[PDB]
Amino acid sequence: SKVTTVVATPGQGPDRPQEVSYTDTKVIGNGSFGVVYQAKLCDSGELVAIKKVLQDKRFKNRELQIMRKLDHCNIVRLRYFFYSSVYLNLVLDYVPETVYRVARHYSRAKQTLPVIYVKLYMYQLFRSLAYIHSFGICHRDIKPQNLLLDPDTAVLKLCDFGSAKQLVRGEPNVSYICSRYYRAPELIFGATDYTSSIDVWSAGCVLAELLLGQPIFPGDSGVDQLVEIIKVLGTPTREQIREMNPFPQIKAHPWTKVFRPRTPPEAIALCSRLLEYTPTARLTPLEACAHSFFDELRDPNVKLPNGRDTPALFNFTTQELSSNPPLATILIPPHARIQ
Amino acid sequence: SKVTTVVATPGQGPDRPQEVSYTDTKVIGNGSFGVVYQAKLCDSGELVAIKKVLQDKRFKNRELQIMRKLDHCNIVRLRYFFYSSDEVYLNLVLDYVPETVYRVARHYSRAKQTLPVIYVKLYMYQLFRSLAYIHSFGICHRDIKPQNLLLDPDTAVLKLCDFGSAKQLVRGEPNVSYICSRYYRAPELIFGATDYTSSIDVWSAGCVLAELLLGQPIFPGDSGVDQLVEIIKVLGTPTREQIREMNPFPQIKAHPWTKVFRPRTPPEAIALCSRLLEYTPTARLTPLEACAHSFFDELRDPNVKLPNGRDTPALFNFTTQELSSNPPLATILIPPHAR
């Protein structure tokens, strides 16, 4: 059998070249920019994903530079990167499933995902957002297909930083990023001075979707998407419009009448605090994690349906808590402060 | 059977309401703003489509205002309109048309069959005629896509429908950039321009033509970013001058339009495509110029017939209004034999 040995640079850490050997190469994705392969590491036998993209030296690769600063349990990690044929090769963690696929299995079976999973998945997504936003980095493409999952452990990892960018106040940014169904209103209206809170709106759309069984703001054009948003949030005031920036009048629709009969009140409350017209009025990722909808994850007795323990949920770092340190009094439960 | 009678106003005639009775009512669509029904007119026996949407009241319905001015064989005609009910509803009684370009194209597509170019010619020609006509009043449709191109299978007549996003574009005035559906949006719209012209409808039409030749959408993508990558792969990276002409940097180079489509693709079809899908808005052909393109010469042949043996539908009955953007074109548009 064939083996490919390369000398790569570690994702993060000291710049000390390393010899990496892998076999079983095969294509698993063809994302616009390049190709994604699944590979097997020769000595550990572990699987990894290798994203291959053409690289022009006119500039340094923006995605690479962002991934070299990140290391978090809820983000697909850059293990190594190396050049070949000139092609940049990113060796990443391999995760078999996605939120999109899992939600789809329940969807066409006329079932909804058990709420313990909605809690676990959403919580981990907010932790990954709090972490990247702490460096001023906005993902700009939060959607179910970019939320990878390991079925057994219930660990979720955010991936694909090809649209990510550090947002600096006063600087303009393109408004055509983010995918259909998950774009914040300010982006549909064409704003170029938006903040990281667009990632929070997207996350709110993912939560709504897992509770509903289908996308909450569907539409093939921005116009149709907005009609759907207004049907739920109601017509925006002129003040809310200015805050998003760049007119059928419908009155507010009770959020409870939006979801099925037995939907947890806390789930509905969280949704309404994420999907707000005014960008500055949306919760921050850290505030979301601290929401009561997630209290059950903080219970010392909570377990996964398969009987295993929940994955890491409270190992917060100073970097991760920097937007609001006092929240640690809530985020790290008592049984996590014992020893 | 439940026969309904109402006092309806003729669509283009003088404001002289008449009693109209219809029967055999059933829902056939859910047009965002409301419901669309099929019904049979009691007197004539004719099938009509009735679009019913809630009305603002202290505001003129824009769709109604635009439809009262149109009467073209390639456009779904407003026959009557009336109000009913504790709020008020506007009902538009329209021509009923059984099929769509969308549905017909999908039939060939999943049967791995190519749509015979005689149909590509007939359908595209009629779409351009309807665009030349509405653009002559300064009206831009803003939502050209396969699902809005209705077809009558036997006669091969095509009619443009759904003027819910249509608007008269006045130079110097700003217009929203979130109109038009994904896959068919012109680049200037993806870049967020608010000073675009009617040529966005021409770009959309070019995407429909490309799609009928290819068997699938030519510029797919769930986000503007992905759509642009697809556009650049074909058109090549835009110069800074072309960008300036669209609105206020992948570095790819043009791919031969000839190599985009399968081998047996008519050269004229490829040439028309390249003249429709141009970055510079002002460089795209006008609808009337498109109709006169050599790709459509076969439709002007006195011996041309439909595959089912019938005669082609009306193709040369041009009015002065319709030709106003460029009268000299009549020397080409109305063939020698054409009565």
> Which residues, in sequence order, are CB contacts of B105 under 8 Å at separation 6+?
B115, B146, B211, B212
Count of other CB atoms within 10 angstroms of residue A195: 19
Closest CA to A168 of A203, A129, A146, A135: A135
* A190 and A273 co-located in one domain: yes
Q: Is A38 in CB contact (< 8 Å) with chain B?
A: no
Pinpoint the alpha helices (H) of chain A: 62-67, 99-107, 115-133, 185-188, 197-212, 222-233, 238-244, 265-274, 285-289, 318-321, 328-331
What DSSP designation does A298 have?
G
Among the partner-chain residues B226, B230, B251, the one whose CB lies closest to the CB of A56 is B251
Among the partner-chain residues A177, A224, A246, the one whose CB lies closest to the CB of B225 is A177
Give the number of beta-carbon pairs within 8 Å between A and B: 64
The CATH number of the domain where B25 resides is what?
3.30.200.20
Q: Report if residue B208 sits inside a domain.
A: yes
Structure tokens at B230: 């697809």
Contact A175, A147 (CB under 8 A): no
Q: How many angstroms separate the Cα of B264 from the Cα of each of A304, B219, B258, B269, B320?
A: 58, 21, 10, 11, 38
Contact B241, B174 (CB under 8 A): no
The CATH number of the domain where A283 resides is what?
1.10.510.10
Q: Report if residue B45 sits inside a domain.
A: yes
Q: Report if residue A177 sits inside a domain.
A: yes
Distance of residue A312 Cα from the nearest chain B Cα, in angstroms: 33
Distance (Å, whole) CA B321 – CA B288: 12
* A232 and A291 co-located in one domain: yes
Q: Which of residues 65-124 of A touch B (CB under 8 A)?
A: none
Closest CA to B179 of A121, A292, A34, A226: A226
Query: What amino acid occupies position B262?
Result: R
Best of B178, B189, B207, B222 to disrupt the A interface (most A CBs within 10 Å) is: B178
> Does residue A17 come out as left (phi exceeding 0), alpha (psi in the -120 to 50 range) or beta?
beta
Q: Report if residue B320 sits inside a domain.
A: no
Instruction: Tell the residue number behind the tokens 């939560």, with chain if given.
Output: A207
* B105 and B251 co-located in one domain: yes
Q: Report if residue B149 sits inside a domain.
A: yes
Best of B59, B225, B229, B231 to disrupt the A interface (most A CBs within 10 Å) is: B225
Among the partner-chain residues A32, A220, A226, the one whose CB lies closest to the CB of B229 is A32
Q: Which of residues 124-183 of A touch B (CB under 8 A)?
A: 141, 143, 163, 174-180
Q: Do A221 and B251 touch (CB under 8 A)?
A: no
* A73 and A154 co-located in one domain: no
Q: How many CA atoms lie within 13 A of A136 on its CB side?
A: 5
Q: Report if residue B230 sits inside a domain.
A: yes
* B166 and B86 co-located in one domain: no
Q: How many angstroms separate the Cα of A80 from the Cα of each of A8, A50, B56?
A: 6, 9, 60
Query: What amino acid occupies position B1?
Result: S
Q: Do B178 and A163 touch (CB under 8 A)?
A: no
* A181 and A213 co-located in one domain: yes
Contact B139, B167 (CB under 8 A): yes
Q: Report if residue B302 sits inside a domain.
A: yes
Q: Do A190 and B177 touch (CB under 8 A)?
A: yes
Contact B96, B49 (CB under 8 A): yes
* A173 and A197 co-located in one domain: yes
* A212 and A251 co-located in one domain: yes
* B49 and B115 co-located in one domain: no
Catalytic residue list contains A299: no
Instruction: Tell the residue number behind the tokens 């359908």, with chain if given.
Output: B123
Distance (Å, whole) CA A67 – CA A227: 37
Beta strands in B98-161 (DSSP E): 99-100, 139-140, 149-152, 157-160
Distance (Å, whole) CA A314 – CA B273: 57
Q: How many residues does chain A have?
A: 339
* A107 and A31 co-located in one domain: no
Distance (Å, whole) CA B32 – CA B53: 9
Long-range contacts made by residues B236-241, C-beta under 8 angstroms, separation at least 24? B238/B187, B238/B279
Distance (Å, whole) CA B67 – CA A286: 52
Which chain A residues are closer than 8 Å to B234 by Cβ? Answer: none
Pick the catalytic residue from A24, A43, A93, A141.
Answer: A141
Structure tokens at B19: 């009693």
From A96, A120, A141, the end of a domain falls on A96
Q: Give the structural domain span for A289.
A: 97-309
Instruction: Tell the residue number behind the tokens 């809630």, with chain if given.
Output: B54
From A79, A96, A113, the end of a domain falls on A96
* B51 and B188 co-located in one domain: no
Could you tell me the sign of the dihedral formed by the alpha carbons of A198, A201, A206, A207, in that order?
A: positive
Q: Report if residue B159 sits inside a domain.
A: yes
* B133 and B203 co-located in one domain: yes
Q: Is A32 in CB contact (< 8 Å) with chain B?
A: yes
Contact A80, A9 (CB under 8 A): yes
Contact B70, B134 (CB under 8 A): yes
Number of domains, chain A:
2
Structure tokens at B231: 């556009």
Structure tokens at B268: 């004229």
Residue A306: exposure state from Cβ atoms within 10 A (0-12, 13-18, ≥19): exposed
Query: What amino acid occupies position A89?
Result: N
